[PDB]
Amino acid sequence: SHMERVFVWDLDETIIIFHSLLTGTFASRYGKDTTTSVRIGLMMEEMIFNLADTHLFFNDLEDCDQIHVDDVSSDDNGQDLSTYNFSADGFGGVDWMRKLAFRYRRVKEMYNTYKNNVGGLIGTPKRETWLQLRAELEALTDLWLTHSLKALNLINSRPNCVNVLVTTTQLIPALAKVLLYGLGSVFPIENIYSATKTGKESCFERIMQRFGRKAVYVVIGDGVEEEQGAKKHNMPFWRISCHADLEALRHALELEYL
Ligand SMILES: [Mg+2]
């Protein structure tokens, strides 16, 4: 009998500031040092891909534009992967399919066990240089992520609201990114979609198929792709282009009881 909202977020320049650190638009728009902006941007980049290659089988998975994490769970025998050896096991298209699923389920396990202990996944001294990086990044972005997190966690703690993520970034890199920015705990992994292949609207429709017509969808983002896909599917769109937009969204989130 309760009304139900599904919030479909964009990641880059919506929930997090990352790409605009490399192009200098954020530093330029908010009066920050561009040299520092790029240094930080690149350091994060290296961390995202290093984590992706080192722990998320990216060198392997890269050439596989899978939308969702469980898309090849058909070929998964559910065995234990604790002692399973991925390095030496082959790296065909049937028994090979079972090895794929093994890697993606293993990615899922890493995410869930480390979404709140990303420093334990990354280890030392990576953990330490990471906490320092997130510290310079928060300072430079005037606490942008702090602002997005307030909305994300309010949608999380609320019973009839759901957080969904649609990102143009590939799936593996997108998860390393989500983890490194501390979003792993706010986004259930089954709720992340890589629109790298199919496109944003394709993912948007797929998400509606999953949640139903009786739900109220809200597309949140800064770009044209999400806004346009939101229009074609006739879903309310909430544009974000400054810290104030996040503040407004958070405010709406706290006035309603479903
Ligand atoms: Mg964007």
Bound molecules: magnesium ion
| CATH architectural name | 3-Layer(aba) Sandwich
Instruction: Please identify the oligomeric state.
Output: monomer
Instruction: Classify the beta-strand content into a percent band.
Output: 5-15%
Question: What Rg do the Cα atoms give?
Answer: 19 Å
PDB class: hydrolase
Keywords: hydrolase, Activator, Alternative splicing, Cytoplasm, Developmental protein, Magnesium, Nucleus, Polymorphism, Protein phosphatase, Transcription, Transcription regulation
Assembly: monomeric
Entry title: Crystal Structure of edeya2
Relevant terms:
Protein phosphatase EYA2, 52% helix, Rossmann fold, 12 helices, 5 strands, binds magnesium ion, alpha/beta, five-stranded parallel beta sheet, globular, 258 residues
Describe the structure.
With 258 residues, the protein is of the alpha/beta class. It has a single domain, classed as Rossmann fold (3-Layer(aba) Sandwich), CATH 3.40.50.12350. Strands 3-2-1-4-5 form a five-stranded parallel sheet, sandwiched between helices. Strand 2, helix 9 and strand 3 form a beta-alpha-beta unit. The longest helix is centred in the N-terminal third of the chain and has 22 residues. It is globular and about 50 Å long. Magnesium ion binds next to loops.
Topology:
Layout: E1 5-9, H1 19-22, H2 25-30, H3 34-55, H4 58-61, H5 96-114, H6 118-122, H7 126-140, H8 144-157, E2 161-167, H9 171-180, E3 192-194, H10 200-211, E4 216-221, H11 224-232, E5 237-239, H12 243-255
Parallel strand pairs: 1-2, 1-4, 2-3, 4-5
PDB class: hydrolase
Keywords: hydrolase, Activator, Alternative splicing, Cytoplasm, Developmental protein, Magnesium, Nucleus, Polymorphism, Protein phosphatase, Transcription, Transcription regulation
Assembly: monomeric
